[model samples]
Target: GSTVPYTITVNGTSQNILSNLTFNKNQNISYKDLEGKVKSVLESNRGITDVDLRLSKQAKYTVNFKNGTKKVIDLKSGIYTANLINSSDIKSININID
Candidate 1:
């Protein structure tokens, strides 16, 4: 499946901010952590101020910024593909399997 794009408006211009950063599932990542990461990414551009996120069970993640513009990011499981692993062998120091 293709990665879902997150679009946010900054100073009257739309931007696909999180197109590069891929997030994994069950990492125990919190909303605050995701918010910080998003803010850091969006604020890198010029004139993108007040980048905020409101996460409700009804609305997954909404990007609010630039004079009250809002965009919703549906955190559905379809986008969270398990494509982040690259290790061929599962080795552990604590385990006796060699």
Candidate 2:
């Protein structure tokens, strides 16, 4: 969707941040490690909660689902298939930027 295009610069911030970093992270929504997602939630109440995410231009991410299923997507310089993996992946939960 339109949400995929992004501009998260170093020391910059991102909005509507969910996860394939989901923290369980695909189905259970487990923030058991509970670090980043927790911070996001807290900021959300105050307004749009932005995250550092420590995201980079080159990264590989794994998405695990509720049904014991998972997929891995690779990135080249923070990009994949013409979109930001961060936005596209968080999608089952439908967060937005606009």
> Model 2: how large is the Cα RMSD against the reference?
12.9
Of candidate 2, the 10-residue stretch with the lowest lDDT total is 2-11
The C-alpha TM-scores of every prediction are 0.36, 0.23
Q: How would you encode candidate 2's per-residue C-alpha lDDT over 1-98 as one tens digit per residue?
A: 22212122122244434433232223322222222443354345324333322333332334333355544443222333332233223433222222
Best by lDDT: 1
Compared with the true structure, the alpha-carbon lDDT of candidate 2 equals 0.32
- TM-score of candidate 1 to 2 decimals: 0.36
Least well predicted 10-residue stretch by lDDT in candidate 1: 89-98
**In angstroms, how far off is 94's CA in candidate 1?**
42
Among these predictions, the greatest TM-score belongs to: 1
lDDT of 1 at 74: 43
